[PDB]
Amino acid sequence: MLKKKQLTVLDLHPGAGKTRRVLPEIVREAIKKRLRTVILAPTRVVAAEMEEALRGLPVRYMTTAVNVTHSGTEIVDLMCHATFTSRLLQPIRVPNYNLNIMDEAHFTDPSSIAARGYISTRVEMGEAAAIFMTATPPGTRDAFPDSNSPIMDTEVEVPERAWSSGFDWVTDHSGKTVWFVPSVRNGNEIAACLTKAGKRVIQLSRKTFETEFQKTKNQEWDFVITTDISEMGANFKADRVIDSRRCLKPVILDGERVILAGPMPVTHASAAQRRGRIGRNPNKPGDEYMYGGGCAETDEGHAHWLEARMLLDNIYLQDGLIASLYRPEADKVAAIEGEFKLRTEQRKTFVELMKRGDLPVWLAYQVASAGITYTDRRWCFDGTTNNTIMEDSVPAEVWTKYGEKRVLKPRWMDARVCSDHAALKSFKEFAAGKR
């Protein structure tokens, strides 16, 4: 695996030991070969699990998720997928790693897609080796891969709303259930219904993941209600997955706005990762996977691949050269390399709108490309009437940095800034000049 110009896909089935058994072996071999190496974890949770699997090996943990004194003897760095892409975009020297290891390399967040593009381009150039670790590489068509123990697979109608009757099998269960829902708001309704029926429910989303995930270990629970983020190497001591088989798809309409389309079917890779949360213990057979719909290739036309192009267009590679998407996922977007490349000051603004502003890539790009500076929030208020953001069926209002109460009416509407209460709250603070 560790010869230059090689990109290896380690596609052992879920629970095969990629992270706990194979990764320490690769790290020892890289150290023996003097390979400057980066290990990319999808989440701070996985970063912490990796420290446990690697404990004692000289690894520099570039994450506050791990509390370790680094010796300065390390040639192996560990950071999150997003941190790698972030450091590439920022005016900061990222070492030219001889060996690039991405764990949970199926992650379809823009920063992970961008990281795979940059690394795969360095490998194609003959500059580096890479190992992508995932049971479900891009374009996988198998929703039912092998597991450590036999899984009971059942196609069943799964509730997406509160229910009074017709789903006795959901609550009649005495074990632990991980339940994949298409959105935070859909999970809130299911979580409330289950809590009302006497169930202990933990809710996971991207925004709450590190904090809430700890509850799965620190307290007894009956249900975890999670969005697609629990597809990225999150492990539970569970005996059942309920899978809606649905997700939201960010879609750019007419180059002008982003909507959250759906809910609609998950990819085969997503279905296999959801299912792959169970059947992981060879000493616990009888785990169940209940699925409520088919799969489809809903990554086609998905905004994340166009956002990944926006990020890669703004990462220095060599002179005017621009990293390509990793070949197997390079047709998911109609996009030309370099079309989103920004001039120096507009690019700094784009980075800051993402890093400090916490705006989605697409929205950060619209603001920066329009020549708006980071602290200029007039655009949050000067959009058309139909860009009005609604809060409980009434226009959302904020006090501007000027002390004026105004209707939140962004020049560019991205549904992700107001997809849930937490998102809208963060966007209100942004429109108000509070970060």
Ligand X SMILES: Cc1cc(F)cc(S(N)(=O)=O)c1
Interacting residues with ligand X (CB under 6 A) = 31, 34, 58, 73-75
| Residues 156, 382: Cα–Cα separation, whole Å | 47
| Residues 338, 284: Cα–Cα separation, whole Å | 51
173 assigned binding-site residue? no
Minimum separation from the CB atom of position 32 to ligand X (A): 9
| Cβ-based nearer residue to ligand X, 73 or 219 | 73
Minimum separation from the CB atom of position 35 to ligand X (A): 9
Minimum separation from the CB atom of position 78 to ligand X (A): 13
- For the sheet with 76-80, list strands across it: 7-10, 129-133, 99-103, 37-41, 76-80, 59-61
Q: Which phi and psi angles does 89 have, rounded to 5°?
A: -70, -35
Minimum separation from the CB atom of position 58 to ligand X (A): 4
CA torsion, points 331, 332, 336, 338, in degrees to nearest 10? -120
Return all residues near 3 (Cβ < 8 A) that are at least 6 apart: 129
| Cβ-based nearer residue to ligand X, 72 or 320 | 72
Of the candidates 113, 124, 137, the residue with the CA atom closest to the CA atom of residue 309: 113
CA torsion, points 252, 428, 397, 258, in degrees to nearest 10? 0
| Cβ-based nearer residue to ligand X, 74 or 376 | 74
CA 419 to chain centre: 16
Return all residues near 415 (Cβ < 8 A) that are at least 6 apart: 250, 257, 258, 259, 260
| Cβ-based nearer residue to ligand X, 60 or 215 | 60
Minimum separation from the CB atom of position 37 to ligand X (A): 9
| Cβ-based nearer residue to ligand X, 37 or 134 | 37
| Cβ-based nearer residue to ligand X, 16 or 59 | 59
Of the candidates 236, 313, 301, 303, the residue with the CA atom closest to the CA atom of residue 274: 236
For 47, other C-beta atoms within 10 Å of its C-beta total: 24
Minimum separation from the CB atom of position 1 to ligand X (A): 18
371 assigned binding-site residue? no
CA torsion, points 423, 428, 431, 435, in degrees to nearest 10? -80
| Cβ-based nearer residue to ligand X, 70 or 217 | 70
Q: Which phi and psi angles does 14 have, rounded to 5°?
A: -55, 135
19 assigned binding-site residue? yes
* Structure token digits, residue 56: 């004692």
Q: Are 294 and 265 in contact (CB under 8 A)?
A: yes
3-state secondary structure of 345: helix
The per-type count for the chain, helices as H runs and strands as E runs, is 12, 18
16 assigned binding-site residue? yes
Minimum separation from the CB atom of position 275 to ligand X (A): 38
17 assigned binding-site residue? yes
13 assigned binding-site residue? yes
| Cβ-based nearer residue to ligand X, 75 or 151 | 75
Minimum separation from the CB atom of position 133 to ligand X (A): 21
Sign of the CA dihedral running 144, 147, 153, 157: negative
Annotated binding site: 12-19
Annotated binding site for ATP: 12-19
